[PDB]
Enzyme design. Structure first.
Site, short mmCIF file in Angstrom:
data_model
loop_
_atom_site.label_atom_id
_atom_site.label_comp_id
_atom_site.label_asym_id
_atom_site.label_seq_id
_atom_site.Cartn_x
_atom_site.Cartn_y
_atom_site.Cartn_z
N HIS A 51 -5.82 0.94 -11.04
CA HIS A 51 -5.73 1.82 -12.20
C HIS A 51 -5.22 1.18 -13.48
O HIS A 51 -5.31 1.84 -14.52
CB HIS A 51 -4.88 3.06 -11.96
CG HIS A 51 -5.44 4.06 -11.02
ND1 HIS A 51 -6.50 4.86 -11.38
CD2 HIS A 51 -5.01 4.53 -9.83
CE1 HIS A 51 -6.75 5.72 -10.41
NE2 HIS A 51 -5.85 5.54 -9.46
ZN LIG Z 1 -5.07 4.70 -7.41
#
Ligand SMILES: [Zn+2]
Ligand SMILES: [Zn+2]
Lengths: 651, 356, 48, 96, 40
Positions: free
Chosen positions: A167
């Site tokens: 992320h």
């Molecule tokens: Zn994640």
């Protein structure tokens, strides 16, 4: 005696080496700070406890020679230890900006409460005083493992590593990652070895979207980015448009990005097997990578409360085997997610055994028949990638607006089917077309068994025009019309009833062309039902035990005949094969006990993927949820239970 | 109706048999012509020859540990006795016979608990419903012998009728296991399971028994009995004495003497069909497939001789003196040890001929 | 292969019950197919 | 380098005792069926000296297959003889 | 002959100890062997 071939060493390259391993006790101190008592009853999103649980599970199977679970160098015979060192700031700056490095630098020298505000502020992250060195070790360990594989020190590596990196975005972090681990290592190896490592194929199965890893290579063609997850854009983290399946790159990286979106949760083994059989292997062989990097995430395992899926650890080994067959033997595994330590433990165990060299076992369920939504989702992905890659054209009829004025010149095809229908009915069953005078309808709207005015038991079977299965050609686009059949669905009952000497009546009601829901059909149905009941049924002297049979729609006619009349004295059973349609609520007007007789004397079969159950009323009248989809399937399936309910209802 | 199948032994059965003849041939000669006594000597001699005839891995004075019984291939069991091979052969003959509709039951009569443990160790993975009619069964299976709320306030629940068309039935041929000991202590244990034929693994079942005559009288036809017939044995003299047309000790001595004198049997019969013979037994007929040998005709046999191997040079002391059970076991022990050393070191050099 | 396969299935009824036979031999496996053409425990495939 | 630095100067306890690996594939070798006596079946040349074009189903086939293996160290039998001491990766099975 | 003899003398053996798993030789290859049994 003649020495024909002198003895030589065996000439192979895969498995005289061992499996690379990167493990540290130094990456378990990046932890959250206590905020509220609610943290004691929540799954602790990224916990340091993930490492030693799996590491404990390993030594129990003899693959690792370590009786007390501590960092050593003598890792046994099947695996080889790869030391980790803190990555310099240069490798981190290969992907990220300069302000994010200073952000994590400043993070190191914060007080307690400023770190609390930092945990509270971030896009689902948490900081700590020991979050700088513990964030520099992942990227370094990844680079070391990938160097070990590329320079052939190990046949393959596996790295149990935290915090995640799929992320973290180049600009700033968000998503429980600090430094983007995949992108850093990929760019440092493409910078360190642009002669052997020239094409990299990155794959993501973590159930969130690898947004940062997407942006890192969204304009890169050497890095085939593939991500599979659930989109659910409104709610499901990250909730970004980068997770949508149309993000297929931009610039030189066009066709070199791929998002695979799951329309809904609850997937299993057959879906993953089906998908990996269809899509990843052609574009992988056509893309021809020199290295396949794996971004493992076990947040979707069977026994996980966040993914809510039912994927078993055998399919994991299967996909590991497929990816091992894809590349030349070079493989690296970095771990990103996971919430339930036992599921991630058994899955990592299976993956590590397949990585040492063991074959994948056979899946616990080879037959689940995947949900319909994901099918057309992958069709749309195939449209885009066929436009981009060649291995999807000419094999799926893709090859990379009909009219609105010729609609006045159209071939009717209701009356042709019904006419042919009438023909083969009358030529073997001698059905009497019954005339509905004072109503403008086709002559072959209804056909009844002869001498209907004397048969007591009269079975009235209402249904729309029949179904058509056609064959579409795969070489180029459109459908082949001459190779189509009519799926006569209401045929087994007509024969069945004629084998038991019943009044049998066929009723066809055509379809309103270019119309979503056949509402005019429902209206015409109520007219035919009421009219037929008044003008004909009440004038037949000998009549008893009427049973109705409804297929799909047109059951509004029956609902109207029940609510707006009182005819339950002679009929004893209503049966409708709903399938997928919306529910026809009974509107009782004569009295209310008719509605309970309705709900009682009824059997309705609706599909598994129907609107409900994702609890109905008695005004719908004892509906039931099938296991299969399709009207034909459920009718041939429950043809016996239906005749059982009819014969049980009668004498 | 009684029937007989001529069966012989195997190589290692004859090796251990001659080991027994070395350890007992002086003493049994003295018998014919608290360590132990000559009664116990002759009884142990008799019982051990019968035990070597029935899978010689039972000759040990120890129970099989009951986990290894089901942790072994069928071959390793039938490598011991020749009887086991012929036995398993007829087993595969009847289960792979052509079957109208028959769910045919048979009873197999062993001699003790060890043999019956081996029997359940052999036919456990096979296609039979096997039930051990004596205690301490080896993995006793539970084969039993023959003789929708989806809504609330409503009540149809047609799930019962629905379930009738889904669940299935077993069809394995019934096979009953017991010992003639319990068949003498108790009775009618075969009167309940109406079987079509009895295969007596021990050939001395003394057929006219109350538990067997009740079934014989109960049956309309004559019930066929099969006695596994050893060619020459300490039972076969008395079987010779029977099939035609204290005191137990003298009979044991006489039949053991007939066996020792008859251990050099030159003629053996063969060409036993099995699927035809099992059909003969099924329809309860006397067909000629059984062989009518019925006997063999009677110093010179007290000398043991092992199988002479290439570059072997093994001999026996023949223990020409007293014997005690501890000395018996240590003697038998190191005799089998030197026999094993002989078979190993003997075999271990014959490779290089074939090599060159 | 017919002799072999019939020996495996007849002589091992405790650990093996369904086999698959493949013939990538470009001549069709004529004799092998007839011996198991009525047979259901064995799935035969021939590429040719 | 680091200051996380988990220091514990004590004899720590065995938790998982050493177990022999629970793998069912490859502590074994690969079976091999080679026998020189299947090389009897040869045609009787009757037409003429057709020795340029002999029979395609030929005894000579087996040897070449067996030969190529020992060219890669898989078989340590030098004269290309099907004997016991083949090597470590495979294991000859007798043919009767 | 040799394997029959050796197999016999190897297991539960005669009364004196003067002379007396991986790989699975004792028919314990777990591919439909235990689950082939009835097990009620
Ligand atoms: Zn994640
Ligand atoms: Zn061919």
């Amino acid at each position: 005696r003649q020495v024909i071939v002198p003895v030589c060493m065996p000439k192979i390259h895969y498995s005289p080496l061992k499996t690379g391993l990167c493990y540290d006790v130094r990456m378990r101190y990046h932890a959250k700070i206590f905020t509220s008592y609610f943290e004691y009853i929540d799954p602790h999103p990224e916990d340091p406890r993930r490492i030693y649980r799996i590491y404990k599970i390993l030594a129990e199977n003899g693959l690792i020679n370590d009786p007390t679970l501590s960092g050593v160098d003598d890792l046994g015979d099947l695996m080889l230890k790869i030391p980790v060192r803190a990555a310099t700031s240069e490798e981190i700056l290969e992907v990220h900006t300069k302000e994010h490095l200073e952000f994590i630098e400043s993070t190191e020298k914060m007080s307690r409460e400023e770190l609390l505000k930092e945990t509270e502020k971030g896009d689902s992250v948490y900081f700590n005083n020991d979050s700088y060195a513990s964030a520099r070790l992942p990227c370094g360990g990844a680079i070391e493992a990938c160097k070990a594989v590329v320079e052939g020190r190990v046949k393959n590596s596996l790295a149990v590593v935290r915090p995640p990196g799929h992320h973290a975005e180049p600009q700033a972090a968000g998503g429980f990652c600090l430094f983007s681990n995949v992108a850093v290592a990929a760019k440092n190896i493409l910078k360190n070895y642009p002669e052997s490592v020239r094409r990299i194929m990155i794959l993501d199965w973590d159930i969130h979207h690898g947004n940062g890893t997407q942006k890192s290579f969204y304009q890169d063609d050497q890095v085939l980015y593939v991500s599979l997850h659930r989109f659910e854009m409104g709610k499901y983290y990250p909730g970004t448009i980068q997770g949508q399946y149309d993000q297929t790159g931009e610039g030189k990286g066009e066709g070199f990005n791929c998002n695979i979106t799951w329309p809904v949760g609850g997937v299993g083994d057959a879906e993953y097997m089906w998908a990996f059989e269809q899509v990843v292997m052609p574009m992988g062989r056509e893309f021809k990578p020199d290295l396949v990097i794996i971004s493992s995430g076990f947040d979707a395992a069977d026994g996980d409360t966040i993914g809510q899926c039912h994927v078993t650890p055998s399919c994991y080994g299967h996909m590991t085997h497929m990816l091992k067959s894809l590349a030349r033997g070079n493989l690296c595994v970095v771990l990103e997610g996971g919430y339930n330590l036992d599921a991630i433990a058994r899955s990592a165990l299976s993956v590590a055994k397949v990585l040492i060299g063991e074959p994948p076992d056979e899946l616990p369920d080879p037959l689940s028949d995947p949900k319909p939504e994901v099918i057309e989702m992958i069709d749309k992905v195939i449209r885009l990638q066929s436009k981009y890659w060649n291995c999807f054209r000419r094999r799926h009829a893709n090859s990379g607006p009909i009219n609105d004025s010729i609609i006045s010149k159209n071939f009717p095809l209701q009356k042709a089917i019904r006419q042919q229908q009438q023909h083969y009915l009358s030529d073997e069953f001698n059905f009497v077309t019954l005339p509905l005078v004072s109503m403008d309808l086709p002559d072959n709207t209804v056909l009844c068994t002869p001498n209907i005015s004397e048969s007591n038991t009269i079975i009235i079977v209402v249904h729309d025009t029949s179904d058509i299965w056609a064959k579409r050609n795969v070489i180029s686009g459109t459908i082949d019309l001459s190779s189509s059949v009519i799926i006569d669905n209401s045929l087994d009952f007509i024969k069945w009833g004629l084998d038991r000497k019943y009044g049998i009546i066929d009723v066809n009601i055509p379809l309103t062309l270019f119309e979503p829901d056949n509402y005019s059909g429902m209206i015409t149905s109520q007219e035919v039902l009421i009219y037929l009941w008044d003008n004909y049924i009440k004038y037949f002297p000998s009549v008893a035990k009427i049973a109705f049979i409804g297929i799909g729609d047109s059951y509004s006619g029956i609902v109207h005949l029940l609510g707006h009349r009182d005819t339950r004295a002679v009929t004893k059973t209503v049966i409708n094969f709903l399938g997928d349609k919306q529910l026809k609520p009974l509107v009782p007007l004569v009295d209310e006990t008719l509605s309970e007789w309705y709900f009682k004397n009824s059997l309705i079969f609706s599909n598994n993927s129907h609107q409900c159950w994702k609890k109905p009323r008695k005004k719908f009248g004892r509906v039931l949820r099938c296991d299969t989809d399709g009207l034909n399937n459920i009718i041939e399936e429950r043809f016996e239970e239906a005749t059982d309910f009819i014969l049980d209802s009668f004498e | 109706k009684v029937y007989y199948l001529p069966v012989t032994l195997t190589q290692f059965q004859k090796d251990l048999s001659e080991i027994l003849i070395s350890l007992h041939a002086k003493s049994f000669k003295a018998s014919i012509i608290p360590t132990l006594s000559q009664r116990q000597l002759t009884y142990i001699f008799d019982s051990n020859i019968r035990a070597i005839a029935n899978h010689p891995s039972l000759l040990v004075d120890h129970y099989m540990p009951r986990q290894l019984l089901r942790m072994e291939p069928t071959e390793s069991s039938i490598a011991g006795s020749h009887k086991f091979q012929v036995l398993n052969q007829l087993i595969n003959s009847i289960c792979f016979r052509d079957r109208p509709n028959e769910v045919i039951k048979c009873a197999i009569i062993a001699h003790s608990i060890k043999e019956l443990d081996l029997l359940e160790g052999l036919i456990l993975g096979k296609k039979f419903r096997t039930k051990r009619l004596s205690g301490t069964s080896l993995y006793n299976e539970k084969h039993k012998f023959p003789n929708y709320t989806g809504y609330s306030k409503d009540d149809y629940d047609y799930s019962v009728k629905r379930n009738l068309k889904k669940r299935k039935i077993n069809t394995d041929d019934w096979l009953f296991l017991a010992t003639t000991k319990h068949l003498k202590h108790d009775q009618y244990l075969l009167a309940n399971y109406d079987i079509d034929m009895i295969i007596s693994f021990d050939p001395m079942l003394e057929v006219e028994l109350p538990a067997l005559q009740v079934l014989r009288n109960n049956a309309n036809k004559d019930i066929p009995i099969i006695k596994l017939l050893v060619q020459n044995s300490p039972d076969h003299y008395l079987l010779d004495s029977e099939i035609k047309n204290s005191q137990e000790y003298e009979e044991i001595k006489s039949s053991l003497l007939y066996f020792l004198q008859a251990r050099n049997a030159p003629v053996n019969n063969c060409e036993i069909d099995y699927i035809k013979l099992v059909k003969c037994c099924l329809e309860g007929k006397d067909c000629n497939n059984i062989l009518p040998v019925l006997d063999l005709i009677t110093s010179g046999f007290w000398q043991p001789q092992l199988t002479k191997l290439q570059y072997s040079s093994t001999e026996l002391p023949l223990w020409d003196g007293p014997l005690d059970i501890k000395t018996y076991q240590t003697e038998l022990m190191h005799r089998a040890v030197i026999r094993l050393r002989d078979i190993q070191d003997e075999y271990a050099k014959g490779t290089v001929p074939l090599y060159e | 292969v017919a002799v072999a396969a019939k020996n495996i299935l007849k002589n091992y009824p405790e650990s093996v019950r369904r086999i698959m036979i493949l013939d990538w031999d470009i001549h069709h496996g004529n004799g092998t197919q007839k011996s198991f053409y009525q047979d259901d425990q064995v799935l035969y495939v021939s590429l040719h | 380098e680091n200051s996380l630095s988990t220091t514990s100067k004590s004899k720590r306890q065995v938790i998982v005792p050493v177990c022999m690996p629970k793998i069912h594939y490859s502590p074994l070798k690969t079976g091999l069926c080679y026998d020189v006596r299947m090389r009897y079946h040869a045609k009787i040349f009757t037409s003429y000296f057709e020795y340029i074009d002999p029979h395609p189903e030929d005894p000579r086939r087996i040897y070449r297959i067996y030969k190529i293996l020992a060219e890669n160290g898989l078989i340590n039998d030098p004269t290309l003889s099907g004997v016991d001491d083949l090597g470590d990766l495979m294991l000859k099975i007798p043919v009767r | 002959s040799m394997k029959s003899l050796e197999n016999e003398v190897n297991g539960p053996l005669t009364k004196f100890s003067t002379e007396s798993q991986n790989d699975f030789q004792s028919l314990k290859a777990r591919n439909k062997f235990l689950k082939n049994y009835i097990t009620l």
